[PDB]
Design a protein around this ligand. Structure first.
Ligand SMILES: *Cc1cc2c(cc1C)nc1c(=O)[nH]c(=O)nc-1n2C[C@H](O)[C@H](O)[C@H](O)COP(=O)(O)OP(=O)(O)OC[C@H]1O[C@@H](n2cnc3c(N)ncnc32)[C@H](O)[C@@H]1O
Ligand SMILES: O=C(O)c1ccccn1
Ligand code: NA
Length: 385
């Protein structure tokens, strides 16, 4: 068979891309090795954080440009997907993390006229229920950030893509890509295809298809523990939070919580460590069982520092984080033009904290696949070998 665009991967980025390509009238196929809506990749769990604020100006401009794309998606599917519970960042204000740097981000919020409330340790403890914070911990609340309904977003994208004519095929694994001057040959475990262009939206598996073409992107894959905790004390404010700390010799020493869940039964909140440790050689090494040390660290930090939750988790899971190895890079998004001959026929989304960007990155991957250019400024994000 032949298509204008073949999308490898049916996670949120692949689905958003297919929606955008199909609604523009092009023939698109999505190939997903497992099932749509699976929780074995980078998109597990119910919640992700929406935030405006970024340490990097170009990415901050992109969140501001993505907000209307979320509102458009919400209107198309008749479901609110972002719930503005707040974005709370606190801790050591100078440490640089994969989340950003507090001090630099506050200066960027000042620059871009984005509102926030600055908080001292006593204010954080009083308002949000944290305890035992070091006296020099400080940060801010950005009240327009909040929580994204992951499963609602996926269902919306699936529905929109299919309604627009995309072919969504699960249980099929892409095993080889060979771009040439005339298009791209796609081989799977079930057959072969020709494509005008291919979009790689395959999460941690990107390098499997790039390495036979002589390319490899510099990302690391981490099997991160996520766990659900019962809210023990009712609270007035329950934002997303992220604790910025200096690393320890053993781990990155960062913790977060997705905050109040406005659509779910009960009163459970998800928290996790954000640890850049024990990168997987290959995603096939994932166990799908929350790492014991990560869980001891997470529950132990919550036990002391967020006693509004019961620190004995009611459920645990994993999620695969895919992050640039270079801390100066946040995302890989672009074509493979610089990576291989005929690489412009491969559009790649390759690493980062991207759920907040799903409507944007789908639109950009569609732009690159069908119009060979995008209006958005993503120069810095271009793929890195
Ligand atoms: C894991 C994680 C991520 C995360 C986060 C916290 C954790 C612990 N918090 C975030 C947040 O608060 N805000 C945010 O903006 N992002 C956050 N993230 C990141 C986000 O979850 C991921 O960036 C995003 O969900 C990734 O989506 P993407 O569509 O890129 O990737 P995926 O869900 O892994 O899907 C890829 C699919 O491809 C299929 N696959 C893989 N190989 C093949 C081949 N060869 N053939 C066919 N299909 C293939 C996979 O099965 C998968 O479904
Ligand atoms: O992008 C974010 O804001 C994010 C990423 C990882 C963990 C929590 N939040
Ligand atoms: Na509830």
């Amino acid at each position: 068979e032949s298509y204008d665009v073949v999308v490898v991967g049916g996670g949120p980025v692949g689905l958003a891309t297919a929606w955008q390509v199909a609604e523009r009238g092009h023939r698109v196929l999505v190939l997903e090795r497992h099932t749509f809506f699976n929780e074995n990749g980078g998109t597990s769990g119910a919640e992700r954080h929406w935030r405006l604020q970024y340490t990097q100006e170009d990415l901050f401009r992109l969140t501001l440009e993505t907000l209307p794309l979320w509102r458009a998606l919400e209107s198309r599917c008749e479901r609110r997907l972002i719930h503005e519970i707040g974005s709370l960042w606190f801790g050591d204000t100078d440490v640089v993390t994969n989340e950003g740097q507090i001090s630099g981000t506050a200066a960027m919020m000042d620059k871009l006229s984005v509102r926030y409330e600055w908080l001292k340790a006593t204010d954080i403890e009083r308002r949000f229920g944290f305890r035992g914070l070091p006296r020099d911990y400080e940060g801010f609340l950005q009240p327009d950030g909040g929580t994204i309904d992951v499963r609602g977003t996926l269902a919306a994208l699936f529905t929109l893509a299919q309604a627009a004519g995309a072919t969504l095929r699960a249980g099929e694994t892409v095993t080889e890509l060979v771009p040439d001057a005339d298009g791209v040959s796609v081989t799977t475990d079930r057959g072969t295809y020709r494509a005008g262009k291919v979009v790689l939206a395959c999460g941690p598996y990107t390098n499997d298809l790039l390495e036979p073409l002589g390319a490899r992107l510099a990302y690391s894959v981490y099997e991160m523990a996520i766990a659900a905790y019962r809210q023990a004390t009712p609270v007035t404010e329950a934002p997303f939070w992220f604790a910025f700390q200096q690393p320890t010799p053993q781990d990155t020493n960062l913790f977060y919580g997705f905050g109040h869940n406005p659509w779910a039964p009960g009163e459970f909140v998800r928290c996790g460590p954000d640890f850049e440790v024990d990168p997987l050689d290959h995603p096939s090494a994932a166990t799908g069982v929350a790492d014991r040390r990560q869980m001891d660290r997470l529950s132990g930090w919550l036990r002391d520092h967020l006693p509004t939750v019961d620190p004995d988790p009611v459920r645990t899971s994993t999620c695969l984080a895919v992050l640039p190895t270079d801390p100066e890079r946040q995302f890989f998004l672009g074509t493979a033009r610089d990576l291989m001959t005929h690489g412009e026929k491969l559009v790649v989304y390759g690493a980062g904290w991207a759920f907040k960007f799903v409507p944007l990155f789908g639109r950009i991957c569609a732009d690159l696949a069908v119009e060979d250019s995008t209006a958005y400024d993503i120069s810095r994000l271009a793929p890195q070998s």
